[PDB]
């Protein structure tokens, strides 16, 4: 044919069935802080009005400088993160060099566009991509946030934050007010956990911090030193701060 | 044109507009009711949703409708507050016209007619599914006097001899929870705990049922009814029962 | 107009709202009811379950009611509709008696029930379905032994006076009827007839999930009514529980 | 049969035609919040038909009696018919009975008008009203202010939060007030927050128009305290607008 | 093309006729320290008629896993035999069993490849129970995995799960009874009780038939492998529950 | 047969890369007019999903080769893809054949890409492009500028009127230019009239966003004369916007 | 039994047949109206189309309805003609019964009710969208006395703050044209030119609107209204204005 | 596989994407006329394009010389019409270069009919293209009767006009009825061309989708005349002159 070095292609021709095809509902947020980007998502899954899951992870580190959060049917979303990570590492092993940021975005858009027919029938997966680009000139401005519409259209945020999922409007309105307070990764992480708190407050499909079972949003932060999972305890303690501060 | 001394029958004949005559709307509630020795208790959540959005968080769904009865209504919020008001006036109207309150059976029958006469509107989604709790003075035994009555959409009514019942989007969860917790009910305080717990369990598995909001301090509302009549349980007593449960789940 | 001394019509003329005419431009249902004739008697019994789809909505439901001193009716179908019919029909019967000083002939009681059923056809088409079984003792009959009567109604009001000796209605009625077809020769009196009846209901519950059989854990059993020359009587729970355990241990 | 002193009831009986029972011009955002000893309510001025802007001067908030105002969202025609009629209904009862309706009776009356429009609302002639009032009979003047929202079936709710909004940009306005509310300590701060929440709604919703500097068109507002209901002067809002605009720059 | 040593692929390529393409049952599964247990009812219905009363719905699929399938009985049974062959086929070709994660992933693909058919009624919703030898902690080794109709899979942190027409009742019951699980025997009692409760509130789930002597079937799995629980140990447990109910 | 068409090649080897066939953000207004020795093209920056504003920085006008630019109005993803694809298609033919396509060939090639999307466009994935170019091989330098519009079936038309627009606010923009056109006498006056027509469209259409002075987002423009296609710098537009705004007030 | 002094309310009561409401009809028109100091002017085209065929070329769509108002109607021709005649009678009827003309606001309200009462029939294509132009005697300022009111299909009415308005198939073109030409209006002559020009522009971009026919000599019809009342503009003065515009475009 | 020397067949076999057919609100509307005069034929078309009621184009050319002795005018969707005119001329010249000799007139007709017919599916969906073909036949026995006019229905059926004139498009009925009265006045290319511009004038008068002569912008119908010396485009000025003549006659 023509070789793009894409695992999605070869996987599709050789083993199309391996390709991805109801639980849904999630809120994922992402914002840029100087020399960094952070991304967090809730843990709820619902089927109609019933809560089908309370531990669901929706934010994944997909390579050393990027993470993706996917909103929509969990089954579609969980696979999607795995496939995209393999796609990225596969190109690096074949060509000995990782894809440019712009190329990582394009590959993801293609995966999303291919899924439009199935998104019209309910297997909708709307991803959010967060990355730090080493090749970019300024470290402070290195962080990137990219959102995708169902047809694969992608957009890079000059806004500073973005969200996707059933509570995304609430989350975005919340960040619109709290953004000026971000000055470093810790404040940025606070604002993200708060925006997700606000979304859970107004949307029954988004679950907020469960203090009884101790389940909290999951987060990932990414700066020049790469992508790291934020530890639970730091999130739990940022939640109680917010809760405590609201009952006040 | 016999006079049934019915306030709604009167409205129908001369004031049709007043009646919720019927030809997404806020909905979603879980109401529970149980019998304890010499008493009946009933509680309901405070949530209202439109699709996935939370439209209300303070909604009251359980109302004392006369000195010995309360009604909790689940379904479309609009249709339920109106139903409780109307039913309470219907009951007090007969009493003033006839100088004597309706027998418990009469009160049940009257509610069933209101329900059944709404089936057409309920088909279109203006559903109202009520739960009735009462204490019968006339009944021979005070301890077993408490009464719980459920209604299906066609007006069918059943008197539950089980000792508990629930209605609303989380009613299955609430009923399974009471099925395990019921043996612990021995007086009005245990019965009210179990009720608040069954409602907690319903909120845990149903996003349409809201559980205790400790941030805003909004809790389920409850009413208890024994030989001395029907009483609103004070918020604080419920709040404390909630913490008890939360504390105990952690 | 022509007065018929009919409580129904009067409700219709002045009280349309009271009438279960709830027909408009899943509700609880499901029951099995059986009835059979024994010399100088008739017996009728029905299960206690109510279902909404696959969920069990009721386990104590009573579907057989004494409607006057010499008749009883069992209604299977939608639970709300069936219960309303039983109360209404009993009032209609006692109403005519008080107005005319004399009870309706058996044929008149049948005809009246058939009109109530037939006038519910439109609503039955819409799921508000009640299909009744009527059991009665006819005092005026020349022979006391052949006095017992069983009448079934189709959804259009057609009625049929059972010549077989037994009948059933409801979701488990085929099973119950096939069972009685084999057990009927054993019926010689009220007690043997009442046993056959509880067994036919047992067999219906065995093959139909909508019909509940005897619940030994909660102690809920079918309800029955027996009617002879001395009038209609509710069979006591314990006599039925006893009869139930006999059948159960006998199947084991 | 039984007189109720209700103008609408009378109209159906003698003047059914007067009664009200695409696409049509629609779209509005309306907010309302309580400040100590008072309540304020404001609404945008835009009207759209699909993507086209059909109106830019539309008034959607009206003083309906000395202690109440109503803001209506939905099909513009049906929403304006509603404010006029509701005001007449209120004054008619007062003249017949020599005393104004209690606050709860005014709410119940509006709920009946709304509910009786459900059929029509299903077919697009929707009218979702927001009611703001000061209750003289209330035990405490500070808590005197009232905000009541209605769902399409007539269900009404008295807000215990402190603010509320209705219309196409209502989510944005509510989320905005959720953050700005603590700053409300009086009628001026409270009016500021309202105009800002409406600014935020126009920012994220093309159906809500924000302040237009070129034409000097600004949201309309009404404030109501123990001394009754009064229209905020345009100029007062215009300068509250620039303040926000300049502050966002 | 790439070989995956999958019996299923082989079938798709060369024997599509063999591939798969009466409902209502309740199946439960829970973790107890050092173990996992899974149980299912025996009823089968067609509408309101009871079509089967002996149906087995829980099968040991390899030495450390069992699957319980809820939905059309035929589809569920075919699925279990096929999955067991797929698992042993990879082992014989590669000389080593699949990792637990690989066994999950394989089941997910079989489920997902039936989504069009499930939309049309041939819905098979499986529950997987297994003990992972390679897992770091032996006590927490046991695993419960549920699948949605699209193949989405979820490993169970709550400690228990259920599927089928009475699954909500069974889940709510275990929610109360779980704290009593401290070992395989208590864990097995809580399972048979949750199934008892499901049968109580759902007519599609059959509970213990004392007249014919038919009881739920169960499988327990710990470090020594998967084993069928003997009927008598269940019948006993059943009788205790009925007596307790009174 | 072999057409040195990157697109035709893509179809045979890489159908996945194509846009494909069988609410998404949309709603843009794009204008273009001819001035002596030049052509100018400009587009708004808004993107809406229903009534919600989904984007406020969207660029919809792209220089596609040294003498042409395309503005696409419609679904945003599709429009952007169309812009990238067409530019590759044009440079691909030049590298394979060593010579750029004639203007008429560029038009025909765009028309085929549009027409081959009609099915998709019936389903909402619409992309209605506007093409602006200067023809070097044109006989007269002053009259060199070209404006071409495409209907959804690929039908193309070269306007002789002097201006054209596409998108949700296009009627407003066109009616505005109809009055303002006589004032265009050089690249600067034509760049003024373009930004004003886009102002007028944003005034009457909620899907077209006008100049955001708070965030400092303005329409993007490209001008093309004998020296090639150049992005107009933001500040020159901002200054033109404030002029118009100021002018609409009183002074 | 409440006398409204309403000709149409009388009609519905007694002779319903005469009412317009019923249930490809000839339709299509462009009507414009603008305010000039001490005056208001209104003009309409003369074409009528059925599909692509021209069914009429002399149609008058602008009518003086009383001494200080005129109405222009766009939509099905049959519906529009009926509305104008009836509205004029309704206005003069109230004046004869009550001895005093309706206030401007009352005239508006009345027209709105006629429109709204045709909504059902409009949904089925019998659409009539009117534009009202009037001079208010009781208005505080004579210069600002002129009024322009537009109606949406549900009867919603709007008084125009902007200075001009248009309705019909070519209304967008006419409105965009006036937006540019409006500053040139300083009196009834400048305002009249700006009106006919806007109608010229509408005819240029919409095939359903006919522009000036120089071969047959058919031109738009116009009415002007100032403190001295409403007048029909004479044809020749419009022909003159048309030729100016035409010549000026070439 | 047989080589028909068909450009269209080659595309269908090798490059379908290029094929006009897009079978799976567009600008459309035109009126085209054609008539025969001794030793000649003339064809003319209007310049308007509409989308609904809006005028989308005012300069559209719809009549094209397709080879030295033929022209085609196409009415329908504009994109489709333009594509057809372009495609058909290539198809004609392609056969001539491959075979060294031009198609016979009947062969040209047949080829156009196949292109039309193969568009029926698309035309059912609104992508209609109804062509009118005018030609001079060199091989005709008599020079005076050499001119040909051929119309096509949507299924590819073609007909040759013995009548002398024909029209297609939204104002074709008006144009035809006008020529019916004016035809006797035709005696040569010049009178023939007047009659044609007049028929198109009449069509514009009664159909809003057909545009008449625009004297303000100076846009007039386009025409092509074809006699033994080949097909020539009539110069704008000769038509503008003819237009004004009719316009003045119409008014005086």
Swiss-Prot record, chain A:
Regulation: The formation of the proteasomal ATPase ARC-20S proteasome complex, likely via the docking of the C-termini of ARC into the intersubunit pockets in the alpha-rings, may trigger opening of the gate for substrate entry. Interconversion between the open-gate and close-gate conformations leads to a dynamic regulation of the 20S proteasome proteolysis activity.
EC id: 3.4.25.1
Single GO MF descriptor: threonine-type endopeptidase activity
One GO biological process term: modification-dependent protein catabolic process
UniProtKB keywords: Autocatalytic cleavage, Cytoplasm, Hydrolase, Protease, Proteasome, Threonine protease, Virulence, Zymogen
Family: Belongs to the peptidase T1B family.
Annotated protein name in UniProt: Proteasome subunit beta
